[PDB]
Amino acid sequence: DKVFFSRLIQILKIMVPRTFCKETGYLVLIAVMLVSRTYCDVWMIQNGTLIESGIIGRSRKDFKRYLLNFIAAMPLISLVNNFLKYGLNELKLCFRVRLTKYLYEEYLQAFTYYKMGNLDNRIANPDQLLTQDVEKFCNSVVDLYSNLSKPFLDIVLYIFKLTSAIGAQGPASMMAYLVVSGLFLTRLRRPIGKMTITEQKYEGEYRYVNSRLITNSEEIAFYNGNKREKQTVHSVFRKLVEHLHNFILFRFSMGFIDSIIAKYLATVVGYLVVSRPFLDLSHPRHLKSTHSELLEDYYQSGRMLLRMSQALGRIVLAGREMTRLAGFTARITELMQVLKDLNHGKYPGAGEIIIADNIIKFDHVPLATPNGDVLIRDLNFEVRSGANVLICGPNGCGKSSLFRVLGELWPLFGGRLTKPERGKLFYVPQRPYMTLGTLRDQVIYPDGREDQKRKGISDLVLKEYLDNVQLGHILEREGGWDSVQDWMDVLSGGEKQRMAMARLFYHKPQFAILDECTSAVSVDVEGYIYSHCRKVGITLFTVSHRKSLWKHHEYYLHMDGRGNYEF
Amino acid sequence: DKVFFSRLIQILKIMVPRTFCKETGYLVLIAVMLVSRTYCDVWMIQNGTLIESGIIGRSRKDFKRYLLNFIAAMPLISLVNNFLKYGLNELKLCFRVRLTKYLYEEYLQAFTYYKMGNLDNRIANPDQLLTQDVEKFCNSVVDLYSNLSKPFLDIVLYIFKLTSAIGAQGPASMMAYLVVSGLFLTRLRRPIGKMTITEQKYEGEYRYVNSRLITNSEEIAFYNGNKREKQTVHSVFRKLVEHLHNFILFRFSMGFIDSIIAKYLATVVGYLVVSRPFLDLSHPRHLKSTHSELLEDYYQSGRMLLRMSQALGRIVLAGREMTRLAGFTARITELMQVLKDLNHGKYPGAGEIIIADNIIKFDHVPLATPNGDVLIRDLNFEVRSGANVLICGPNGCGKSSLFRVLGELWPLFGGRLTKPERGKLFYVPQRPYMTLGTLRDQVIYPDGREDQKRKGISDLVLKEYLDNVQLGHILEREGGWDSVQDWMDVLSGGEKQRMAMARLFYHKPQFAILDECTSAVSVDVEGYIYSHCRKVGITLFTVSHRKSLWKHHEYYLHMDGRGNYEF
Ligand SMILES: CC(C)CCC[C@@H](C)CCC[C@@H](C)CCC[C@@H](C)CC(=O)SCCNC(=O)CCNC(=O)[C@H](O)C(C)(C)COP(=O)(O)OP(=O)(O)OC[C@H]1O[C@@H](n2cnc3c(N)ncnc32)[C@@H](O)[C@H]1OP(=O)(O)O
Ligand SMILES: CC(C)CCC[C@@H](C)CCC[C@@H](C)CCC[C@@H](C)CC(=O)SCCNC(=O)CCNC(=O)[C@H](O)C(C)(C)COP(=O)(O)OP(=O)(O)OC[C@H]1O[C@@H](n2cnc3c(N)ncnc32)[C@@H](O)[C@H]1OP(=O)(O)O
């Protein structure tokens, strides 16, 4: 994985912006507590064998002297190991916040929550990539920082310490054995992941014959069915997935061999290397004039060799985890590339859109879907603020395609388009959109709260806007202007359309779409809404099947879904 | 959980039927290798400290004497340790097979795969209750057998051995400290699972505001959208789920306290109790007149106290796992009771069904849906073998209720019914049912090839049956009478209906239902099928919307869907 490091650097520069920040501060703090954690671990090794030497030296003075050193130093030892884990966890959180604040300026920039989900197919689940995969990526880049550099400082320190303690060949025949036996064991157990997938395949298709029996049992039951679908499930279970007995038999024999040359013969090698200074009376540098320092020197060397040996089991596992980290940075870099692709207008684009006021002419503009299939050839019409348009047709596949192009939600396949910008086009579907929040932020949704007051507005004006739609009892009944509850369930039917009309009245757009929305609204207040929009100047694009709504539309556009149209 | 043991006993008698079987044999073998594993663990404790005493006694004779004992005994130690794991795994598999061969005799008895699915509501997913929860239950009843009795034999053995080695108060002040400090730690860390759910709630609703943004982005993008839905997700993240920082701060302080009184102060207590025979120079029974055998006695007592202390951490965890085992035996006993309930008929039954030949009369019998509704007040008609019946109506909700009652798939809501038993009623839906297996078994499905010969039939006759349906080229195209690949994909169209008609011809039932099946079959083939059925005498209950198919039905039944019928 050569490009994995190159891709990981780009993400790292996002999560470590400058050289003076808390993330840089935590990185130094963890590195300081990684070094000081190894010293505390060695100090326990040296002090621990001095409590034990004083116990069996039968001196109460030596036992008290070295037990009190342990008691005095354990508040500091516990501080080091536990403030290192605090620094790791805080770095995981700081990394996640740094990435999220970068993956959400690109995501929610112009229309990218929409284009990346319902206009391209690069990412199947956008949501799972911005909340779930971001958390696991950050939890693995500092996990690899710790799990790789923690059992590496002591590897260097124990090799440096076991040398000049059991000789240079001491922690080298242990390295040779742990590596040679590790490679041989891994090669020997090759058919473990080979028959793990076979078990998973047999498990996966044992649930299939069960699910196929249930979601299809209607026909199996009329004619008897059982005793034939019973032997189908039985054969998949009794015959197919009972290699577990062959899998269990292999794991027993493999376990019998890997528990000898990696668990008991590894210690036999450990005894041999450590015992060289002791079973050699002509050893000048080390023990030659020692009486009970032989005891402390052995268990210091014996405990160091055990920690040096078991640090490889954690540096090997850390390298294995790097493959998972390589998988995560692939999806993050894929998501980052996709977000940067759509932010420039990529996923088409030949046509030009020029922002104009009260001009919506579609002069020589096709109606191609984002794939490219043109369904309307020669759209050419203009309407002005003051004349309504009724859209007619059997709603096949083109009714909900002119609006998407109109709102710039879909690409323009050539031609010149004039229309107001995003803030003036309004679309009201059959079920209106209710916002997660209070009752006040359902009338003023696309506007915020702080910038709502600067428009010279008041809650009384919000009430009278909401009163014009024949809805004044909900405000008092629900709990007030700041009552927070789910408005998709606590509201059902006409009141949603009434609140949508109230929002439209409050915002006062230039053009509005009423696609099969006014279906549970009284006809008198419907005419009132039409008159209000006409007198204030809210042009409406009415889509309806009711024949009585044909008196407030100066123009009329019809789509057949076959290729032609009349205006 | 008093009844949990009572329920677990009933399941155990299923998986341990008699006192002479493999499960009894494995249970004794595991118990034998559980006792002999503790002896091998103690023998390593005693032998291990004799290699170390020989090393630092600087005698090569003692090092070789006790290293060769370790080398000679390590094939047997590994054999004992890995034959226990083999016995556990084999018991897990033998338990799963014993339960499955009991949960599938009750499941596939008469219509219970069908009744439990869409006639009861006790189990929502019966599929993941006979393959997935059965495996995890058996994997936990013997995991509890090992994980509870393994760190209990050594608990008794180490207490018996540490006593008379460091005195009776030795492994009692350690029991007192571990139990008392364990309770204090658990009580102190009460607000860990209390704020774990708060994090999960905040995590779960951070994914909600993301998913609600995606599955609803169509209307959001038509407004300006962002800067209002951007601050909704931001507030759920930046404000709400940063209790992690308060969760991280608590875990640092809580960890700082539990790493002192349970990790470093536990050893300080361990030093104090073990050291009593040594610093007491007047200890008469123990090492009063000994050489430096205090070395071997200390580390034998020191290693035993560490294994005795750490055997409690596994007996505590074993008890915690019992709660999960209590959950599993609830679903297994719930499934077992539902299986036994339906085998007699429960979920109704007022009417009586008496088997007969060629008569399907419905004198004074309603067609009630097995819920609290009735769609036909009283059906009353009879047909004779040889007279086809056409069923009319726009198949709303009553057409697919006469057939279910006819096949005994639904209960009889009073009245007297005469009809042939399960093997003679036939129902062919719009898409026929194809069976996992060869091409031969798609013609003879509810029969087996083993019982296919007892009818005096041959593959030539099967081909002849396949010839009458105007479909004979598929046999030699797919690979013969043994082509295995699934037939819901290779066949797409009228071939499935042709094979269903071939199966109908082969089985020669008394009555058959042709509910909207013949929709991709040429009219000549329809006439041939009807003529062949009339000649042989297979009465047909035809459901069709074609007016031309009205000349070969002596009778005619009409379900208007209002509550009455026309026969
Ligand atoms: C500073 C400079 C001067 C020099 C700097 C140079 C440095 C940086 C070099 C850096 C090298 C690294 C970076 C290179 C890595 C490349 C490699 C990763 C790639 C592969 O392709 S490689 C694939 C498999 N590679 C394995 O590496 C798995 C095996 N990894 C294991 O870690 C063990 O195999 C296991 C833990 C499973 C062993 O089993 P454990 O029992 O679990 O550990 P152990 O058996 O090895 O112990 C050892 C022994 O110490 C002795 N000992 C203990 N206590 C004693 C006592 N009281 N008295 C006397 N002796 C004692 C024994 O008695 C015995 O102790 P026990 O542990 O058995 O009790
Ligand atoms: C046979 C008859 C005569 C009598 C039969 C009677 C029997 C059956 C009675 C049966 C009792 C049972 C059934 C009742 C259970 C009821 C209970 C479950 C209900 C609760 O409501 S209870 C809720 C929490 N209950 C805990 O129980 C958690 C804490 N459970 C732990 O298990 C550990 O706490 C942990 C694993 C965290 C170990 O803690 P750790 O600190 O991580 O290890 P450790 O330190 O404790 O080991 C101990 C020390 O031995 C000394 N020792 C070691 N090496 C030495 C050396 N070389 N020299 C000298 N001394 C040494 C130390 O120095 C040191 O070990 P080292 O740290 O030195 O290595």
mmCIF file of C-alpha atoms in Angstrom, chain B residues 25-216:
data_model
loop_
_atom_site.group_PDB
_atom_site.id
_atom_site.type_symbol
_atom_site.label_atom_id
_atom_site.label_comp_id
_atom_site.label_asym_id
_atom_site.label_seq_id
_atom_site.Cartn_x
_atom_site.Cartn_y
_atom_site.Cartn_z
ATOM 1 C CA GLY B 25 -19.241 -38.956 26.893
ATOM 2 C CA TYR B 26 -18.015 -35.457 26.067
ATOM 3 C CA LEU B 27 -19.314 -34.082 29.371
ATOM 4 C CA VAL B 28 -17.247 -36.633 31.299
ATOM 5 C CA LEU B 29 -14.211 -36.021 29.076
ATOM 6 C CA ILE B 30 -14.396 -32.255 29.633
ATOM 7 C CA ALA B 31 -14.700 -32.769 33.393
ATOM 8 C CA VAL B 32 -11.702 -35.117 33.317
ATOM 9 C CA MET B 33 -9.633 -32.622 31.314
ATOM 10 C CA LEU B 34 -10.828 -29.784 33.546
ATOM 11 C CA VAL B 35 -9.410 -31.511 36.622
ATOM 12 C CA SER B 36 -6.250 -32.594 34.799
ATOM 13 C CA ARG B 37 -5.742 -29.110 33.338
ATOM 14 C CA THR B 38 -5.509 -27.603 36.825
ATOM 15 C CA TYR B 39 -2.938 -30.208 37.862
ATOM 16 C CA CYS B 40 -0.889 -29.408 34.761
ATOM 17 C CA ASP B 41 -1.129 -25.708 35.637
ATOM 18 C CA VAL B 42 0.091 -26.281 39.200
ATOM 19 C CA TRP B 43 2.846 -28.622 38.005
ATOM 20 C CA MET B 44 4.171 -25.814 35.801
ATOM 21 C CA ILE B 45 4.071 -23.493 38.823
ATOM 22 C CA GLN B 46 6.176 -25.893 40.886
ATOM 23 C CA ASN B 47 8.495 -26.957 38.060
ATOM 24 C CA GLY B 48 8.875 -23.424 36.727
ATOM 25 C CA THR B 49 10.292 -22.150 40.016
ATOM 26 C CA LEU B 50 12.725 -25.087 40.110
ATOM 27 C CA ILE B 51 14.246 -24.227 36.743
ATOM 28 C CA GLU B 52 14.655 -20.666 38.024
ATOM 29 C CA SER B 53 16.198 -21.810 41.309
ATOM 30 C CA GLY B 54 18.636 -23.982 39.374
ATOM 31 C CA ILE B 55 19.564 -21.083 37.092
ATOM 32 C CA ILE B 56 20.393 -18.661 39.913
ATOM 33 C CA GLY B 57 21.774 -21.345 42.160
ATOM 34 C CA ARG B 58 24.395 -21.425 39.399
ATOM 35 C CA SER B 59 24.189 -25.218 39.051
ATOM 36 C CA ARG B 60 23.999 -26.637 35.537
ATOM 37 C CA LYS B 61 22.888 -30.027 36.869
ATOM 38 C CA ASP B 62 19.722 -28.576 38.409
ATOM 39 C CA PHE B 63 18.980 -26.468 35.329
ATOM 40 C CA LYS B 64 19.150 -29.524 33.065
ATOM 41 C CA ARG B 65 17.274 -31.703 35.560
ATOM 42 C CA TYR B 66 14.230 -29.424 35.663
ATOM 43 C CA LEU B 67 14.316 -28.104 32.095
ATOM 44 C CA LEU B 68 14.180 -31.658 30.733
ATOM 45 C CA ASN B 69 11.178 -32.368 32.960
ATOM 46 C CA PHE B 70 9.484 -29.383 31.330
ATOM 47 C CA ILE B 71 10.503 -30.511 27.839
ATOM 48 C CA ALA B 72 9.316 -34.074 28.469
ATOM 49 C CA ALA B 73 5.982 -32.985 29.953
ATOM 50 C CA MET B 74 5.076 -30.247 27.465
ATOM 51 C CA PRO B 75 3.658 -32.675 24.844
ATOM 52 C CA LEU B 76 1.282 -33.950 27.543
ATOM 53 C CA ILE B 77 0.445 -30.471 28.859
ATOM 54 C CA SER B 78 -0.421 -29.282 25.349
ATOM 55 C CA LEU B 79 -2.411 -32.469 24.738
ATOM 56 C CA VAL B 80 -4.452 -31.889 27.900
ATOM 57 C CA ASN B 81 -4.965 -28.191 27.153
ATOM 58 C CA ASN B 82 -5.997 -28.696 23.519
ATOM 59 C CA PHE B 83 -8.094 -31.825 24.061
ATOM 60 C CA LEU B 84 -10.225 -29.816 26.482
ATOM 61 C CA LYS B 85 -10.842 -27.200 23.787
ATOM 62 C CA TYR B 86 -11.661 -29.985 21.325
ATOM 63 C CA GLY B 87 -14.124 -31.515 23.782
ATOM 64 C CA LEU B 88 -15.820 -28.162 24.351
ATOM 65 C CA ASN B 89 -16.185 -27.388 20.642
ATOM 66 C CA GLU B 90 -17.463 -30.886 19.877
ATOM 67 C CA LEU B 91 -20.040 -30.538 22.657
ATOM 68 C CA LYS B 92 -21.140 -27.179 21.242
ATOM 69 C CA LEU B 93 -21.743 -28.838 17.873
ATOM 70 C CA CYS B 94 -23.378 -31.932 19.382
ATOM 71 C CA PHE B 95 -25.701 -29.678 21.388
ATOM 72 C CA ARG B 96 -26.727 -27.667 18.317
ATOM 73 C CA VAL B 97 -27.469 -30.811 16.298
ATOM 74 C CA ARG B 98 -29.527 -32.268 19.153
ATOM 75 C CA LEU B 99 -31.631 -29.110 19.480
ATOM 76 C CA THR B 100 -32.069 -28.593 15.728
ATOM 77 C CA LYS B 101 -33.309 -32.158 15.230
ATOM 78 C CA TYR B 102 -35.981 -31.296 17.827
ATOM 79 C CA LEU B 103 -36.937 -27.749 16.815
ATOM 80 C CA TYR B 104 -37.411 -28.915 13.209
ATOM 81 C CA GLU B 105 -39.610 -31.943 13.862
ATOM 82 C CA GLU B 106 -42.128 -29.640 15.543
ATOM 83 C CA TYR B 107 -41.578 -26.833 13.023
ATOM 84 C CA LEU B 108 -42.249 -28.912 9.897
ATOM 85 C CA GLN B 109 -45.104 -31.103 11.166
ATOM 86 C CA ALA B 110 -48.211 -30.015 9.244
ATOM 87 C CA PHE B 111 -48.457 -26.313 8.503
ATOM 88 C CA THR B 112 -46.384 -24.837 11.301
ATOM 89 C CA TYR B 113 -43.744 -23.206 9.068
ATOM 90 C CA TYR B 114 -46.785 -21.439 7.606
ATOM 91 C CA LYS B 115 -48.969 -20.861 10.669
ATOM 92 C CA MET B 116 -46.186 -19.215 12.663
ATOM 93 C CA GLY B 117 -45.330 -16.825 9.830
ATOM 94 C CA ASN B 118 -48.546 -15.101 8.749
ATOM 95 C CA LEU B 119 -51.084 -16.521 11.218
ATOM 96 C CA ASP B 120 -49.419 -15.791 14.590
ATOM 97 C CA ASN B 121 -47.527 -12.791 15.931
ATOM 98 C CA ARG B 122 -45.568 -14.403 18.786
ATOM 99 C CA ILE B 123 -42.320 -14.645 16.783
ATOM 100 C CA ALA B 124 -41.601 -11.876 14.285
ATOM 101 C CA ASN B 125 -38.616 -13.605 12.625
ATOM 102 C CA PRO B 126 -38.888 -17.401 12.886
ATOM 103 C CA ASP B 127 -36.009 -17.708 10.414
ATOM 104 C CA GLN B 128 -33.454 -16.213 12.818
ATOM 105 C CA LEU B 129 -34.693 -18.408 15.665
ATOM 106 C CA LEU B 130 -33.915 -21.940 14.429
ATOM 107 C CA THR B 131 -30.504 -21.310 12.839
ATOM 108 C CA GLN B 132 -29.042 -18.203 14.498
ATOM 109 C CA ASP B 133 -30.330 -18.178 18.082
ATOM 110 C CA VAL B 134 -30.024 -21.962 18.410
ATOM 111 C CA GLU B 135 -26.310 -21.758 17.590
ATOM 112 C CA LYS B 136 -25.673 -18.964 20.095
ATOM 113 C CA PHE B 137 -27.661 -20.716 22.832
ATOM 114 C CA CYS B 138 -25.659 -23.940 22.559
ATOM 115 C CA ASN B 139 -22.407 -21.978 22.285
ATOM 116 C CA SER B 140 -23.296 -20.374 25.643
ATOM 117 C CA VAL B 141 -24.646 -23.295 27.688
ATOM 118 C CA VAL B 142 -21.282 -25.074 27.413
ATOM 119 C CA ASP B 143 -19.270 -21.848 27.501
ATOM 120 C CA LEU B 144 -20.893 -21.319 30.895
ATOM 121 C CA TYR B 145 -20.071 -24.940 31.739
ATOM 122 C CA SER B 146 -16.374 -24.309 31.097
ATOM 123 C CA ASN B 147 -15.974 -20.635 32.044
ATOM 124 C CA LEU B 148 -17.675 -21.264 35.408
ATOM 125 C CA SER B 149 -16.194 -24.619 36.463
ATOM 126 C CA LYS B 150 -12.695 -23.966 35.105
ATOM 127 C CA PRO B 151 -11.843 -21.007 37.403
ATOM 128 C CA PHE B 152 -13.535 -22.765 40.299
ATOM 129 C CA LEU B 153 -11.600 -26.017 40.629
ATOM 130 C CA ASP B 154 -8.385 -24.010 40.911
ATOM 131 C CA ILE B 155 -10.063 -21.564 43.310
ATOM 132 C CA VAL B 156 -10.690 -24.484 45.664
ATOM 133 C CA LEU B 157 -7.298 -26.018 44.876
ATOM 134 C CA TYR B 158 -5.307 -22.798 45.319
ATOM 135 C CA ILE B 159 -7.123 -21.927 48.549
ATOM 136 C CA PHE B 160 -6.343 -25.443 49.781
ATOM 137 C CA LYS B 161 -2.714 -25.049 48.668
ATOM 138 C CA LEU B 162 -2.083 -21.440 49.727
ATOM 139 C CA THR B 163 -3.434 -22.444 53.108
ATOM 140 C CA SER B 164 -0.672 -24.364 54.897
ATOM 141 C CA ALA B 165 1.690 -22.244 52.759
ATOM 142 C CA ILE B 166 0.962 -18.668 53.877
ATOM 143 C CA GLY B 167 -1.580 -19.601 56.535
ATOM 144 C CA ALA B 168 -5.359 -19.568 56.626
ATOM 145 C CA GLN B 169 -5.449 -15.756 56.740
ATOM 146 C CA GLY B 170 -3.406 -15.639 53.534
ATOM 147 C CA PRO B 171 -6.086 -16.454 50.961
ATOM 148 C CA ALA B 172 -8.784 -14.845 53.093
ATOM 149 C CA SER B 173 -7.511 -11.271 53.341
ATOM 150 C CA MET B 174 -7.078 -11.462 49.569
ATOM 151 C CA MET B 175 -10.649 -12.730 49.236
ATOM 152 C CA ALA B 176 -11.771 -9.970 51.589
ATOM 153 C CA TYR B 177 -9.897 -7.264 49.684
ATOM 154 C CA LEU B 178 -10.860 -8.427 46.189
ATOM 155 C CA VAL B 179 -14.540 -8.758 47.101
ATOM 156 C CA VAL B 180 -14.724 -5.527 49.113
ATOM 157 C CA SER B 181 -12.711 -3.487 46.611
ATOM 158 C CA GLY B 182 -14.697 -5.019 43.758
ATOM 159 C CA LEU B 183 -18.016 -3.957 45.275
ATOM 160 C CA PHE B 184 -16.693 -0.462 46.010
ATOM 161 C CA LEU B 185 -15.437 -0.061 42.438
ATOM 162 C CA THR B 186 -18.716 -1.264 40.917
ATOM 163 C CA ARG B 187 -20.694 1.079 43.167
ATOM 164 C CA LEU B 188 -18.321 3.956 42.385
ATOM 165 C CA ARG B 189 -18.587 3.458 38.606
ATOM 166 C CA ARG B 190 -22.399 3.378 38.620
ATOM 167 C CA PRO B 191 -22.559 6.466 36.282
ATOM 168 C CA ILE B 192 -20.786 4.590 33.487
ATOM 169 C CA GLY B 193 -23.709 2.611 32.122
ATOM 170 C CA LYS B 194 -25.936 5.543 33.057
ATOM 171 C CA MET B 195 -24.117 7.855 30.630
ATOM 172 C CA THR B 196 -23.399 5.061 28.154
ATOM 173 C CA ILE B 197 -27.068 5.091 27.139
ATOM 174 C CA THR B 198 -26.975 8.897 26.905
ATOM 175 C CA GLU B 199 -24.085 8.631 24.445
ATOM 176 C CA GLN B 200 -25.957 5.917 22.540
ATOM 177 C CA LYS B 201 -29.082 8.089 22.474
ATOM 178 C CA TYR B 202 -27.032 11.046 21.222
ATOM 179 C CA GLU B 203 -25.240 8.832 18.693
ATOM 180 C CA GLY B 204 -28.513 7.295 17.532
ATOM 181 C CA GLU B 205 -30.173 10.663 16.965
ATOM 182 C CA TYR B 206 -27.083 12.100 15.278
ATOM 183 C CA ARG B 207 -27.593 9.476 12.577
ATOM 184 C CA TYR B 208 -31.281 10.422 12.511
ATOM 185 C CA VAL B 209 -30.735 14.082 11.611
ATOM 186 C CA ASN B 210 -28.380 12.843 8.890
ATOM 187 C CA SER B 211 -30.788 10.240 7.492
ATOM 188 C CA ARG B 212 -33.680 12.703 7.716
ATOM 189 C CA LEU B 213 -31.545 15.116 5.685
ATOM 190 C CA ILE B 214 -30.968 12.549 2.921
ATOM 191 C CA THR B 215 -34.343 10.805 2.600
ATOM 192 C CA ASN B 216 -35.953 14.263 2.490
#
